[PDB]
């Protein structure tokens, strides 16, 4: 990298607008003979809590959230893309609208950012950008492929599941996506299930035992007496009675088989944690969910909460070791032994190079 | 100056929407029980009080909204929280009360008491004790049974009468005296089936949302109001038992009249529905939601009804309520549902001045 890489280079401002918090990313990059980017590096990023969905839109509060986002940017005279995901989803048009008006006019008032598109995409147009960010960080965009890549985004509000599949008339065109980059043609299956990110579906199970250490006080008043395979049916019961994911993805899936799967998302930070052990950035499910039912479950809530203070999210490291088997595994047929990479959490990898290479 | 020749209390309802104070004067009869309760002032805010950022200043400008024009001072305070609450682990509700709690011991117009959140069982007490008082049932025995449901925003109550059983939690149960008589209640609240939480699992249903309605999936509403009834009743017993856990005792100690209180009042008293005496049945309830919303024209009925911001969920709500309530709860799709007149306010608060443990 250079000193000032936005003298030598062209350079664009993408802002994940995600539940629980906003990233922004400033990439810089140089084009090939198409004028699409390539040699993609990102020169600044900064992450704010909480959701942009969270705040009571008026001109003080946003102007206070988008403050805090981008004024110790090291460039500001560059495009903007600002796209928000299933925290805005979770309202109706008509209250998302208020955000959008308020955010508009925040950026016509200022002479730097050039704002191109602020507006909440859909679930398939994530999971399109990140299948991108993905496969352009393990450098399989360049030429056609012996093997196939899938990727799943495990978010707070919602999930993604993205992965190659030929052209299906009788599937929504809404679940498939066919591009053209670098000189070839790619044809993917994309599907997102908003209220099966990790925050929203942990309001439904809040008061079962078995999904919390032992004498962990349950807001009920009932005490904690985990069991992770138990946990797990009750979370499968939300995948497929409620939102029938097996009968979705499974056929799709049995028919277009991936070679190799990649998570990113709030995955990456349970898998990193270390009452588990893992190599090569890698799990299975099955080691996954016993590791989650001996270290965690059936350990005494007390203990483990002194013995970890590092872990913010430690209270929930139960339900989310079942919730994450009962989504790839029951939801969406992964066998339990399968490798599922993830990508290490310091790398704050999200779905934001694909709008570099997708607009 | 009501407080100078009666007791006054203020009682905070800090739900998952809103924040609603309310300050009551009563005297006691020779028990030391309240009587001749009477509402002197109140006040609503929003948003919920555990949405906010917890610090200082965002606390101050918060609790300012909400007390400082008050007409009456000086006076105890219980600040109690809900469901909207109950959803952050207690590692973060600390923040919240740590920040309160600063700032109650920084004034002298308040005497704080206390400042927690109670629990589901707690509310779904205070709930019925409410909603009895109001009725002048609490004074004698009853020869009726009176069942109580709160339908909030994140948790939902439901509180009926029940003799003391060995066999069920003590959480679930509660006896109390009042009046000099002995009272013994079931209690149970679910939390993530309030209207809020409940919703965030089917936003993508076609089923539950008028006819071409924009779903954030890029999908069309195709309104039908038993079949989003039939997706929400998988979440309520699929997942959650409600009704394994409700309808046998139910069965056994049947109720006689029911009352709702929550947001269901809002839905029930809007331009789309009518009802008359302030009651509803699921049966009337399900088939106006589906008639008047789910099969309409999303466009079209938008641009006839631009003063309802809740409009667009009025197909998956009537569904809801009556997945709860009958594929849920037992109750006769026919059975009279009193709800209370929404323009009242009536939320759990005169419950706490009645019974404060
Ligand atoms: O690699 C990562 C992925 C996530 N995170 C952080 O974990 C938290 C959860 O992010 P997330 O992927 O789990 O959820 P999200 O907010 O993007 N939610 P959604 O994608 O809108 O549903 C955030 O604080 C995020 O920055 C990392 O630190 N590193
Ligand atoms: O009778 C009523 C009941 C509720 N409301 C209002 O509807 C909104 C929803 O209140 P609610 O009872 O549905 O939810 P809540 O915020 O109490 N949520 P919870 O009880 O914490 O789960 C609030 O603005 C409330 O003041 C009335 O105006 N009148
Ligand atoms: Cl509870
Ligand atoms: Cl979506
Ligand atoms: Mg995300
Ligand atoms: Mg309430």
Redesign the interface.
Same mark, same amino acid.
């Given at each position: 990298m250079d000193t000032n890489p936005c003298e030598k280079h062209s350079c664009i401002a993408v802002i994940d607008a995600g539940s629980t918090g906003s990233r922004l990313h400033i990439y810089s990059y140089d084009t090939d003979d198409t004028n699409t980017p390539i040699h993609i590096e990102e020169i600044w990023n900064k992450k704010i809590k909480?959701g942009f969905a969270?705040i009571?839109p008026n001109s003080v509060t946003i102007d206070a959230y988008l403050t805090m986002l981008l004024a110790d940017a090291p460039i500001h005279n560059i495009p903007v893309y600002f796209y928000a995901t299933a925290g805005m989803?979770?309202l109706?048009?008509?209250?998302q609208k208020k955000y959008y008006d308020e955010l508009d006019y925040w950026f016509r008032q200022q002479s730097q950012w050039q704002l191109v598109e602020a507006k @909440?995409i @859909?679930?398939?147009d994530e999971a399109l950008f990140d299948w991108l960010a993905v496969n352009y960080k393990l450098d399989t965009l360049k030429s056609v492929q012996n093997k196939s890549v899938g990727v799943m985004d495990m978010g707070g509000?919602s999930v993604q599941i993205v992965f190659p599949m030929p052209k299906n008339a009788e599937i929504?065109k809404?679940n498939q996506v066919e591009l053209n980059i670098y000189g070839q043609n790619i044809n993917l299956y994309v599907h997102?299930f908003?209220?099966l990110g990790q925050t &929203?579906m942990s309001?439904?199970?809040?008061?079962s035992p078995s999904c919390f250490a032992n004498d962990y006080?349950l807001?009920?008043? &009932?005490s904690g007496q985990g069991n992770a395979p138990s946990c797990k049916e &009750?979370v499968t019961?939300?995948m497929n009675?409620?939102?029938k994911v097996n009968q979705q993805i499974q056929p799709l899936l049995a028919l277009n088989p991936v070679n190799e799967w990649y998570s990113i998302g709030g995955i990456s930070n349970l898998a990193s944690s270390q009452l588990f052990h893992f190599e090569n950035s890698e799990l299975t499910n099955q080691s996954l969910l016993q590791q989650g039912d001996n270290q965690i479950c059936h350990q005494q809530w007390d203990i483990l909460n002194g013995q970890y203070p590092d872990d &913010?999210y430690l209270?929930?490291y139960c339900l989310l070791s079942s919730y994450y088997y009962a989504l790839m595994v029951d939801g969406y047929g992964i066998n339990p032994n399968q490798t599922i990479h993830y990508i290490p959490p310091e790398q704050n990898l999200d779905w934001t190079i694909g709008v570099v290479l997708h607009r």
């Amino acid at each position: 990298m250079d000193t000032n890489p936005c003298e030598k280079h062209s350079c664009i401002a993408v802002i994940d607008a995600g539940s629980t918090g906003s990233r922004l990313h400033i990439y810089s990059y140089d084009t090939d003979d198409t004028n699409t980017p390539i040699h993609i590096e990102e020169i600044w990023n900064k992450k704010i809590k909480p959701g942009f969905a969270s705040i009571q839109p008026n001109s003080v509060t946003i102007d206070a959230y988008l403050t805090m986002l981008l004024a110790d940017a090291p460039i500001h005279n560059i495009p903007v893309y600002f796209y928000a995901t299933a925290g805005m989803r979770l309202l109706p048009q008509s209250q998302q609208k208020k955000y959008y008006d308020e955010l508009d006019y925040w950026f016509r008032q200022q002479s730097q950012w050039q704002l191109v598109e602020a507006k @909440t995409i @859909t679930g398939n147009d994530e999971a399109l950008f990140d299948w991108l960010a993905v496969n352009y960080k393990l450098d399989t965009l360049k030429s056609v492929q012996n093997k196939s890549v899938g990727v799943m985004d495990m978010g707070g509000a919602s999930v993604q599941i993205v992965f190659p599949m030929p052209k299906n008339a009788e599937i929504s065109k809404h679940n498939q996506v066919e591009l053209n980059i670098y000189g070839q043609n790619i044809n993917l299956y994309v599907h997102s299930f908003l209220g099966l990110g990790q925050t &929203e579906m942990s309001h439904q199970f809040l008061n079962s035992p078995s999904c919390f250490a032992n004498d962990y006080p349950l807001p009920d008043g &009932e005490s904690g007496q985990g069991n992770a395979p138990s946990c797990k049916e &009750e979370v499968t019961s939300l995948m497929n009675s409620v939102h029938k994911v097996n009968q979705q993805i499974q056929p799709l899936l049995a028919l277009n088989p991936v070679n190799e799967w990649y998570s990113i998302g709030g995955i990456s930070n349970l898998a990193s944690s270390q009452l588990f052990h893992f190599e090569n950035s890698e799990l299975t499910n099955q080691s996954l969910l016993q590791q989650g039912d001996n270290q965690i479950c059936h350990q005494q809530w007390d203990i483990l909460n002194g013995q970890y203070p590092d872990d &913010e999210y430690l209270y929930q490291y139960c339900l989310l070791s079942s919730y994450y088997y009962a989504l790839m595994v029951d939801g969406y047929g992964i066998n339990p032994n399968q490798t599922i990479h993830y990508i290490p959490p310091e790398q704050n990898l999200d779905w934001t190079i694909g709008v570099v290479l997708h607009r």
